Amino acid sequence: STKSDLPAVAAGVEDQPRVPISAAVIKLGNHAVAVESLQKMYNDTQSPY
Amino acid sequence: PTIAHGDGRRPSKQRTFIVVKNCHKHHISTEMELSMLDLEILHSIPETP
């Protein structure tokens, strides 16, 4: 069964206490989609993007 | 800071930059004139109106 397998498949991350993540998101149609810019994390070290 | 990459390239050691910033001094001049007859009556106290 699906619901029977649902504990067994998520033997990990499931039921871990949640934290607030700061990140910009958008809404496109019916989908909430996260958006990121990572040029900071590669220009500070002077490595090409 | 730097990044570790799985690529065969040599890792680069820790690095610091030490930067010196220097002052600028600016000079400003103004001029005033005072009459001698003007400075004359300032010391004495008037008696007639």
Swiss-Prot record, chain A:
Localization per record: Virion; Host nucleus
Highest taxon, organism lineage: Viruses
Its biological purpose: Self-assembles to form an icosahedral capsid with a T=16 symmetry, about 200 nm in diameter, and consisting of 150 hexons and 12 pentons (total of 162 capsomers). Hexons form the edges and faces of the capsid and are each composed of six MCP molecules. In contrast, one penton is found at each of the 12 vertices. Eleven of the pentons are MCP pentamers, while the last vertex is occupied by the portal complex.
Assigned protein family: Belongs to the herpesviridae major capsid protein family.
Subunit details: Homomultimer. Makes the hexons and eleven out of twelve pentons. Interacts with triplex proteins 1/TRX1 and 2/TRX2; adjacent capsomers are linked together in groups of three by triplexes, heterotrimeric complexes composed of one molecule of TRX1 and two molecules of TRX2. Interacts with scaffold protein; this interaction allows efficient MCP transport to the host nucleus. Interacts with capsid vertex component 2/CVC2. Interacts with the small capsomere-interacting protein/SCP.
Protein name as annotated: Major capsid protein
Part of the intact protein present: 347 to 395 of 1381
